[PDB]
Design a protein around this ligand. Structure first.
Ligand SMILES: CC(=O)O[C@H]1[C@H]2[C@H]([C@@H]3[C@@H](O)[C@@H]4[C@H]([C@H](C)C[C@]5(O)OC(=O)[C@@](C)(O)[C@]45C)[C@@]3(C)[C@H]1OC(C)=O)[C@@H](O)C(=O)[C@H]1C[C@@H]3O[C@@H]3[C@H](OC(C)=O)[C@]21C
Ligand SMILES: CC(=O)O[C@H]1[C@H]2[C@H]([C@@H]3[C@@H](O)[C@@H]4[C@H]([C@H](C)C[C@]5(O)OC(=O)[C@@](C)(O)[C@]45C)[C@@]3(C)[C@H]1OC(C)=O)[C@@H](O)C(=O)[C@H]1C[C@@H]3O[C@@H]3[C@H](OC(C)=O)[C@]21C
Ligand SMILES: Nc1nc2c(ncn2[C@@H]2O[C@H](COP(=O)(O)CP(=O)(O)OP(=O)(O)O)[C@@H](O)[C@H]2O)c(=O)[nH]1
Ligand SMILES: Nc1nc2c(ncn2[C@@H]2O[C@H](COP(=O)(O)CP(=O)(O)OP(=O)(O)O)[C@@H](O)[C@H]2O)c(=O)[nH]1
Ligand SMILES: Nc1nc2c(ncn2[C@@H]2O[C@H](COP(=O)(O)OP(=O)(O)OP(=O)(O)O)[C@@H](O)[C@H]2O)c(=O)[nH]1
Ligand SMILES: [Mg+2]
Lengths: 426, 428, 426
């Protein structure tokens, strides 16, 4: 009965959404033609949360794909598992943003947001009782950031009572990729403060460190990482689809995680992680999973956990387990590290268990932490902004398209507000 | 429910551990793949379903023997995390094994020790094999021993050291290594058995009737001695010992803790047909001086503490009669103030022989450990070598260029003279 | 109606108790399954001295096993006759002491004392009117001597008017089996003189001479020696369980022997002792029993019994006998040897006769002597102890646990006080 539609913006978002629908069609046991070849009865009774039926026993995935560059749309159309989308969904323009936030927010949005809003109105009208939407984009470029944030503000002023998820990557400390990065990054944070319930963050280089030292691969690729972001997404949404001994959908996690409205930036993690060679020797228990969970090496963000204090922890498990064990081990991890958690929040852990594991494993576990130390990341963003804002470099390209300096100052002011709000409770 | 974790440091340690783990995996019927087609939890961990892991850490700062292991036939057995390898050898220098290069690798092996200590309950001690004359095999041993006696506190620790021979020499800086290592390990280690090479050479040449030994034969002997020690833990017996026993029987004062170990019988298969082996002749043959594993004269002192472990089907009345006829002789004199210097142990399991080895199926076996006196005369010999290499300031710049001061050698000489004089005072 | 619970402490007393429950369970005719299969009704009117009937006519013994290394408990439990012990009784530690009396007394004893006292408190409150407690420990090792010592001190703090039996193998004149043995012996005697009503001393070398020169054995194992100790224990307490013509329970013996309340170290012995080689050349009437009893080389202690005089003698007989023969030949034995006996106690015999024999033989007898010649053994303890105390040897393994030197001086003065008492009365 609960219903979630999908909207993919940006290149990185389009690729990880292709991999998202890939792992969803592999978890739910269906075929790239849309036809059914599954085995169990559990995989069809909850299919209304991500798909829709059609005249002729055909299934449509519930997604809308937005961009401005038709090359990536040709890429997801030509490849495998590009058949299942409906051809009324592939909406784009012809111009492109060129990694410029002002053009994507103030010029191309006026041409595209009308059609996208009409189609998402029809699709949200097609469903019975909607829970929320989730988008995938980045925080570095021009198309994904600006078009996603504009769509999210329109969606918040349209539906004021539903949840939002955003699986968005954030900039890296060691090596950058784009020169115009901190401008659109700070402006995107300025919109995501206002228009979104919850948003997890990914850093690329921590994914590189995980894929190097723990997975032990010779050739790390973009798709592999995309699959790790995908496995996080599936392991978060895995309670709306299968029954369990203690279920927890997304609004329950939203009200368990944030204590305050503006403290809504999380860090995810996956478990268990082992390579091909070293696979057989160590076991698959709740001790090994809970040990591999709480580490600085498991964290999929460029932030050290033990430089700050955890506020909340939500651990969503998958498999067939034993409950008193995981509660006793949560008690053990709470008793071991007393300096690492908030003192006025007692029993800082939240536990969820679902039955059906991901196919190929006997057990799995997803971690979501809310720890304040990510202000350090905000520091190494916002200070950098001041450097460029000391010399006013690259600015007239944004300025000629209808944008002023005062909104840059107010967006930096809001970023200052959030980093000092993290700094107060520390 | 009684556990023990073994570490291997240096080249002598990793090859002698290759022989020891060969005997261990041969002992309980386990294939080298790590599967078997309920007491061996005492040295092994169980892996999920149908697999076993040994409890070992083979730490070497020279990668070639670790690569020889990983290419060797025991490749599938261990866990590939537990083979910690540095980047540069020590080149027989004590400062490079204690200070300069080895300090970059201590965090990994300490995390490995702390991770292997978490999977067990009633951890009893560590068994670290190491040599004296080498650089990394003594310097890193000093660093790990000091760090573990700081960290763990009140648990046991037993060592196996290779004794540098008086006559035979391979390296030239070996008195420096032994003197500084005994200077720094005297306080923290609990009891360390001493074993020389040249006595193993002589008992190989004369008793087993062999002409030319390769290094694996000496390692087979020392591995058989190790198995004979811990066979009272691996199974049951009529009168059993464990690892927390020997400290109360072998160590009178918290300084003198240096025993020598011996085995019996040392025979070939062709000498084993024409002699029926009673307990009396083998218990007497423990005290012939040509079969002691250290080049020393036991007639040049007294015997302070003496422990015995038996293996094979031996009844105890003849054991008590054999000790009674041992003590009544004249040549085997004992110390005045210690009238009961005997600690007896019997196990039901008979030993097994390695195929392609040098032992025949003998029903009995004796291990005898002795804390005697006259070994310290050998100390004087070793100490005398140090005097030569300090009388002309030989090789001092190769040591002081790595972060040492000159007063440490004088403090080591003072400590060794103090140890010898404490010894002779207690003796006379 | 008179009840005795059983505690085994250490390794030596544990193996002795395994053979002891073997012998008693064979004698009363009950099977290792717990079901009854005896022949008469004479057994089952008196089974409540040791066992309990439990809900479906299965019987359990009243035993509590105590050690600090688990493998002894595994060897008892997995072996035969290991089913009838109730698994709530097995209480042990995990560390072990290993010939350190301070470790067997001060450190691990405070870890196990409350659990063992709780189980024995439930076992004592389950009973109607208990007569005595019995413990079996050794005088050499650490956990046996130390935990038996602390257990006896706690029990006589708890129960003030219940008697205590204690069977203790005593250190050897020829060759010891432990190295720190006189320290253990001196402290254990220092507490056993304080808190015990009766106790016995057993040597290993006397058992060796018994199995050599009279039995003609070739291959003696420890179970067989323990069978001799089991036979002496059953012969002492066969009167509580079966009818008598001059009956003698435990309190009769306790008020029979001791003239002064410190001198309660007995030497026991058993008769007959027959070999299958020389079985035919003997007859079996009461002169054979009374001549093999009053014997030099048949004593179960390595002290020549005619190295002094006797104080008191008790003799418990088993079989269908004649009483006039018994007391006239006891007066005959006291008539023959006038020098060997204290004159200021006249009538230096104490007798008892019960009906049932051991299984297979007709007549048997148990000899118990309180003599003074055992003072020689006391000398060969304390002399040895003084030599080690003259050089402060092996003290630091005790001293780093919590023991001080004044303990050793007080214990040495107590032992020289006890040999002063034994030299006072001869
Ligand atoms: C941990 C692992 O190796 O998983 C592989 C996947 C498989 C990955 C597969 O997608 C590989 C990936 C490779 C590591 C990389 C890859 O070649 O490039 C990509 O972009 C991937 C991720 O799509 C490609 C094609 C693989 C091999 C792997 O993806 C990685 C390295 O995360 C995936 O297809 C499966 O079927 C999984 C099924 C069982 O769960 C296990 C494995 O994944 C998990 C979550 O444990 C899979 C065998
Ligand atoms: C006494 C003797 O030599 O006969 C044996 C026992 C028997 C002993 C038996 O228990 C043997 C013991 C062996 C000497 C040792 C033994 O193998 O190991 C043990 O722990 C014993 C004592 O249980 C074992 C299994 C034996 C042979 C012996 O037990 C001993 C040595 O006390 C025992 O089972 C009997 O039934 C006895 C009955 C008849 O009285 C005779 C014999 O005992 C007596 C009282 O002299 C028995 C046949
Ligand atoms: N995990 C992945 N991250 C990616 C992948 N492709 C890009 N990225 C990341 O996305 C970051 C942001 O890219 P953008 O969305 O800004 C590209 P933009 O929309 O500005 O331009 P166009 O692609 O021309 O529309 C980029 O710096 C990379 O760090 C991918 O395949 N996988
Ligand atoms: N009658 C028996 N005496 C035994 C047996 N095993 C050992 N002993 C006696 O044990 C005596 C020494 O005491 P122990 O060492 O047994 C007591 P221990 O220190 O081993 O106890 P733990 O600390 O619990 O291990 C020695 O005189 C032996 O004759 C046995 O099976 N039977
Ligand atoms: N019993 C026995 N002794 C060995 C063996 N191999 C080497 N030794 C001895 O090792 C001693 C030298 O110390 P080593 O441990 O080899 O030197 P190292 O610790 O490796 O120092 P580096 O060369 O810098 O790596 C020599 O005296 C050898 O007699 C062996 O296989 N068996
Ligand atoms: Mg080397």
């Amino acid at each position: 009965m609960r219903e979630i539609v999908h909207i993919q913006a940006g290149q990185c978002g389009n690729q990880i959404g292709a991999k998202f629908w890939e792992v969803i069609s592999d978890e739910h046991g269906i075929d790239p033609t849309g036809s059914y070849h599954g085995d169990s009865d559990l995989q069809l009774e909850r299919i209304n949360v991500y798909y829709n039926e059609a005249a002729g026993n055909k299934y449509v995935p519930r997604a809308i794909l937005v961009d401005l560059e038709p090359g990536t749309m040709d890429s997801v159309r030509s490849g495998p598992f590009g058949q299942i989308f409906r051809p009324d969904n592939f909406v784009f323009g012809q111009s492109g943003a060129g990694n410029n936030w002002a053009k994507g927010h103030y010029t191309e949005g006026a041409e595209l947001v009308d059609s996208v809003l009409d189609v998402v109105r029809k699709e949200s009208e097609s469903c019975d009782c909607l829970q929320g939407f989730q988008l995938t984009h980045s925080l570095g470029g021009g198309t994904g950031s600006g078009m996603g944030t504009l769509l999210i503000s329109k969606i918040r002023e349209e539906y004021p009572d539903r949840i939002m998820n955003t699986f968005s990557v954030v900039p890296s400390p060691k090596v950058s990729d784009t020169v115009v990065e901190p401008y659109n990054a700070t402006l995107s944070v300025h919109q995501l403060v206002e228009n979104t319930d919850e948003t997890y963050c990914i850093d690329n280089e921590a994914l590189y460190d995980i894929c190097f030292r723990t997975l032990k691969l010779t050739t790390p690729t973009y798709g592999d990482l995309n699959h790790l972001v995908s496995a996080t997404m599936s392991g978060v949404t895995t309670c709306l689809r299968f029954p369990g001994q203690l279920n927890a959908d997304l609004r329950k996690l939203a009200v368990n995680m944030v204590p305050f409205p503006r403290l809504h930036f999380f860090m995810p993690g996956f478990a268990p992680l082992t390579s091909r060679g070293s696979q057989q020797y160590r076991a698959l228990t709740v001790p090994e999973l809970t040990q591999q969970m709480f580490d600085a090496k498991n964290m999929m963000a460029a932030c050290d956990p033990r430089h700050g204090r955890y506020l909340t922890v939500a651990a969503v498990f998958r498999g067939r387990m034993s409950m008193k064990e995981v509660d006793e081990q949560m008690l053990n991890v709470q008793n071991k590290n007393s300096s690492y958690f908030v003192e006025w929040i007692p029993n800082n852990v939240k536990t969820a268990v679902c039955d059906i594991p991901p196919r190929g494993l006997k057990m799995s576990a997803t971690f979501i932490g809310n720890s304040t130390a990510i202000q350090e990341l905000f520091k190494r963003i916002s200070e950098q902004f001041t450097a460029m804002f000391r010399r006013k470099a690259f600015l007239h390209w944004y300025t000629g398209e209808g944008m002023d300096e005062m909104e840059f100052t107010e967006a930096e002011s809001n970023m200052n507000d959030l980093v000092s709000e993290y700094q107060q409770y520390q | 429910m009684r556990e023990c974790i073994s570490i291997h440091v240096g080249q002598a340690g990793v090859q002698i551990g290759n022989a020891c783990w060969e005997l261990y995996c041969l002992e309980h019927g386990i294939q080298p793949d790590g599967q078997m087609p309920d007491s061996f939890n005492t040295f092994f961990s169980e892996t999920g379903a149908g697999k076993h892991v040994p409890r070992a850490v083979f730490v070497d700062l020279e990668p070639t023997v670790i690569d020889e292991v990983r290419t060797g036939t025991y490749r599938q057995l261990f866990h590939p995390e537990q083979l910690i390898t540095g980047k540069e050898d020590a080149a027989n220098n004590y400062a490079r094994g204690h200070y300069t290069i080895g300090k970059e690798i201590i965090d990994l092996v300490l995390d490995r020790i702390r991770k292997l200590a978490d999977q067990c309950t009633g951890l009893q001690g560590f068994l670290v094999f190491h040599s004296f004359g080498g650089g990394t095999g003594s310097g890193f041993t000093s660093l790990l021993m000091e760090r573990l006696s700081v960290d763990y506190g009140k648990k046991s620790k037993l060592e196996f050291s290779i004794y540098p021979a008086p006559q035979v020499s391979t390296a030239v800086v070996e008195p420096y290594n032994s003197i500084l290592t005994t200077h720094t390990t005297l306080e923290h280690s609990d009891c360390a058995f001493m074993v020389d090479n040249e006595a193993i050479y002589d008992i190989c040449r004369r008793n087993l009737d062999i002409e030319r030994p390769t290094y694996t034969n000496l390692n087979r002997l020392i591995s058989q001695i190790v198995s004979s020690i811990t066979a009272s833990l691996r199974f049951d017996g009529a009168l059993n010992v464990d690892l927390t026993e020997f400290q109360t029987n072998l160590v009178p004062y918290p300084r003198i803790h240096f025993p020598l170990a011996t085995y019996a019988p040392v025979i070939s298969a062709e000498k084993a047909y024409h002699e029926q082996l009673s307990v009396a002749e083998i218990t007497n043959a423990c005290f012939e001086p040509a079969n002691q594993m250290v080049k020393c004269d036991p007639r040049h002192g007294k015997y302070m503490a003496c422990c015995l472990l038996y293996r094979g089907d031996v009844v105890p009345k003849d054991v008590n009669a054999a000790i009674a006829t041992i003590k009544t002789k004249r040549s085997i004199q004992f110390v005045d103030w210690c009238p009961t210097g005997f600690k007896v142990g019997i196990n039901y399991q008979p030993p097994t022989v390695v195929p392609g080895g040098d032992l025949a199926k003998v029903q009995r076996a004796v291990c005898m450990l002795s804390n005697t006196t006259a070994i310290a005369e050998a100390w004087a010999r070793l100490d005398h070598k140090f005097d030569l290499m300090y009388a002309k300031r030989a090789f001092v710049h190769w040591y002081v260029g790595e972060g040492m001061e000159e007063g440490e050698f004088s403090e080591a000489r003072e400590d060794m003279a103090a140890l010898e004089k404490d010894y002779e005072e207690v003796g006379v």
